[PDB]
RNA sequence: UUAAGAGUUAAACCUAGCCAACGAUCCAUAAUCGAUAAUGAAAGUUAGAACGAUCACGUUGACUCUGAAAUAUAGUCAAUAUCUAUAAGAUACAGCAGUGAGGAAUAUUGGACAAUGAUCGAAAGAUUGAUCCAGUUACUUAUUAGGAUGAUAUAUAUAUAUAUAUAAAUUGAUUAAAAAUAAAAUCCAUAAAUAAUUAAAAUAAUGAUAUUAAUUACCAUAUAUUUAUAUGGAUAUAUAUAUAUUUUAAUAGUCCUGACUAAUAUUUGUGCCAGCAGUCGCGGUAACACAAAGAGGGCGAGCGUUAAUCA
């Protein structure tokens, strides 16, 4: 039996009571407000645990089940805070032992419902520099470095390319203070990883704007075939991108 | 593509590929998808709703059907084979931007692409549907990445009023410190866990007038001398940048900060490399999704038959 | 580069009148300037009001003058007096009846 | 139930149900006929189209307007 | 162009984006009908080049794929190439200057054969 | 779309590739041997038997296969300028150069086609001759299988 | 007779055969096919529009010349129907536009031979309703068709959970009943426009398309390897030179909500009537099914319905 079910919170929350007729409020909005907490004059929600990013290389992901739906905490002391019948946030009646009892992997699990999802580790900048020096300068092949550092070859090659771009930007100082701040912030939000054919180029006399290039090919294999299927007016219309990035019909 | 409408409605409670606060709450309160007391068709429909709200909301249904690949790829724990239902979308350029944390949404990444801020191997790509091959390197203009991962720049009026309030509270603090300095210092240490000149060093600030400061931002810049924001209106250190200029991470960023496996990211340069297509492995899937394997398999059975 | 006027072709107007094909109406457009005749392409001719057939023909004859090949007029092909092949039989039947 | 006897352009003769709240069809009106039978009436195998020929759209129709030839 | 057998270009592709098929065909048959043989393909549009690459010194390249040994067989038999096919084959070195015409100086780049 | 799967998933047809030499060459001995080998008559037979009469107005045996001599085609078709009788001509030199190129091209084509046929036939024959080694080594492996036999009748042998 | 076999056609003379319930003969219908299109897990089934291959025809029938090849879109004769020139006349749009009829229904009385071909010519070059382009038509397919932030408005007095008041607060409802982050507002963009310039289709030259694609938001050069600081022509200003250097958005329908079958937030009108309906079926004062309001669920520049094909 399927029913159009308004997505009310699974946890218990303080619902509406008798309301002024002109309030025009909904329970979902109250749940929103209780999840967030008071709104600062700056527009912030400091009371929430998720307003501010972490800074100790331990990602902070939503844990509504392990929190029983209580998502408010003191911004400084970081001790839990919960709503009260008085209407002012105050200390909980009892300790929530399950917030203390977090599995090692669940700390790295982004979404509660999907256990298989996990966040990759960020390589330390020193490790990136070490890989770049080992490959570019010493000459150790990507296989050797991957075996050395427990990494995959394509990741190693991507690291080399990115460190090349980083080197160029640092040479020109194209990096800005905002970019450095974002880099340092994001780096601290994630756990840190611990260690032939015949070709003829035709003659180009002066004033020619382009050069013919002839590639050898065999009859029965070269050409556009006659009676080929026309897919343009069909859903499987083939589309590609020219090297300029222009969309073309391939 | 689909015209965005009621994407973040709390009644519907569908999680979207976004860093928004409303999306955060919708993810928070959902718990898990309810597939119980439902026929097979109803289970498939619920799985479609939940999964298709996240993976490709913009894609048209009759377009997603054509894009959908009935044959998946997989390289003791159990392999989650059917989480790869939507792995085909992970090679699209906009999805790559969103997963690289170069945008706060797939739609925002789409606008970044369509507005010419994105390059793939050094050629400006203006088409969100461009598919990334393994080893491709794609980059975004750093200003747009900083805007995506930064707080909204306040208007002049909003930040001016915020400064008004900050002056009011700073004057309050120094007043109370002057009245009762010794225990003020001791109790401040109480949180941190006597020199009477301490309160003497602190200096008042003059309340500003909105009517007189309106429309004169260079004047307002000189008129503010708070200890923390010296000579700039709040959030507008350089008012010619697209973001909160004393660069501040956007609110509610920790919940959605997943580092993808298939991409290798360089935040300092706003570059990324597409290592591979996402592949399921024993006990882990590289398709970042908020739904469990049962939901994905129900969606997969739906799309195999096209709803039959 | 520009080729110099010949004694056969002193000025632009001589060239226009010689090549014919009703092109002699374009004397004003060129303003008798040899150099401008031998410098601009069909985009400028299009802007200046020359229609398709003309500007193509004048560029052809300009090229002929550049490579020294003669620029004499060759009249565009006309249909037969009795008429086109498809209508020739009926027209001959009518014409012979009238005479 | 309102039905009409219709001679088609191929020469056949059929019985067609006139849907909608109000029919503006009289004798010798020009109509367009589509398939579909009036389930509770035996012998009316066809549906007259509303909004074509001499049949107008259902007056003051505001839902399923397309099926009944209405405008908005 | 004369004779029954002619080496021509048959137009393939879509509107506003021609590509051509170097074919050996009957003169009397339609341009886009199936020919005696398909000797190659010719993409007229030059490969676009970056403004930087213009300064570096490369030029746009036009892609022709051809069967060199078979085209020699057809030229030997007396198949008569067309003007565009004559231009293409003459640049390839298959045809020498004997096929040049009066209507058609220095060499920046001489023809080169490589693997 | 289904039928294309039979041909490597290729939609559209090329014209059937033509043959430079329409009939086997003389140097291609194998086709001559098959052609001039004894004709089999029997359950699987190709010709009228010895005492059997063929129809009065028909030929008893099929038309003989005319084997091309590549030298003969090159001499008759292509040939050579018998004499160098000529003078300076705007068209004469052009035509001579054209004809020389065409002559060279057709000669090369015929020779290369003969060469590919010969090399291919030798290739197939060689492959079969090496496969003979596999057969004979298998037979040798049967010897060692039955070298260790005590001559008692065995069920597998029964 | 033919280049050529054969009761293929004509002549002559013999024999009595040949086909047939595994369907002859006759009748009706149909152009056939693919490495084409649709569908299915597949065998297959359907179409034969589009791309391509073969055949037949060019108002109807027969015959003749030429020719290698023709019962030719040729010629003669006749038939049908029109026109004038009234003659041992011409024409037959199944060539491109276009008109009338028939139909549920299928477009421009368009531009250019610039390209790729065809014909003529020694050549220059000429012709080309082939062809290439554009026009009309959502008929089909693809890409765009805006992101981020966002539940209040006033007054008070190197820290930071700021707190107090008052005022208002649309629809529905009195709480897990919502509409609704939806609006507005704010931040930031881009399209279009406006300026420049500007390829490529084509080269010896020739560009219909074309008010070209695309690039930059003053213009170049001079270095580095896209971002920069410089030199030089712009630029109004105030008073050669400190300054800045076009502007700028937002635009969604159509079907459905008893089950099949996704659609709980509820109300009104009607009362076996009006009506709905693919099947079950609904409609007699309490209609989740008719007609509507609210809310909701699909698909979305399409949605539904009819007609057909496959499963
Ligand atoms: Mg239901
Ligand atoms: Mg003449
Ligand atoms: Mg028929
Ligand atoms: Mg049939
Ligand atoms: Mg037919
Ligand atoms: Mg066809
Ligand atoms: Mg047609
Ligand atoms: Mg005929
Ligand atoms: Mg007719
Ligand atoms: Mg006839
Ligand atoms: Mg017509
Ligand atoms: Mg032409
Ligand atoms: Mg014309
Ligand atoms: Mg009310
Ligand atoms: Mg209805
Ligand atoms: Mg119903
Ligand atoms: Mg569409």
Residue numbers in the entry:
A (entry chain 6): 27 to 221, 291 to 345
B (entry chain D): 2 to 76, 88 to 205, 372 to 486
C (entry chain 2): 30 to 128
D (entry chain L): 78 to 149
E (entry chain P): 2 to 105, 110 to 120
F (entry chain V): 2 to 159
Text lifted from the article:
State 1 represents the earliest intermediate missing significant modules of mito r-proteins and exhibits high levels of conformational flexibility in the head region. Ccm1 uses structure and sequence-specific RNA recognition, binding to a single-stranded region of the precursor and specifically recognizing bases −6 to −1. Ccm1 is therefore in the unique position to chaperone mitochondrial pre-rRNA in a co-transcriptional manner similarly to eukaryotic ribosome assembly factors binding to other 5′ precursor elements.
Mitochondrial ribosomes (mitoribosomes) synthesize proteins encoded within the mitochondrial genome that are assembled into oxidative phosphorylation complexes. Biogenesis of the mitoribosome requires trans-acting assembly factors that chaperone rRNA folding and guide mito r-protein incorporation. Here we used cryo-electron microscopy to determine nine structures of native yeast and human mitoribosomal small subunit assembly intermediates, illuminating the mechanistic basis for how GTPases are used to control early steps of decoding centre formation, how initial rRNA folding and processing events are mediated, and how mitoribosomal proteins have active roles during assembly.
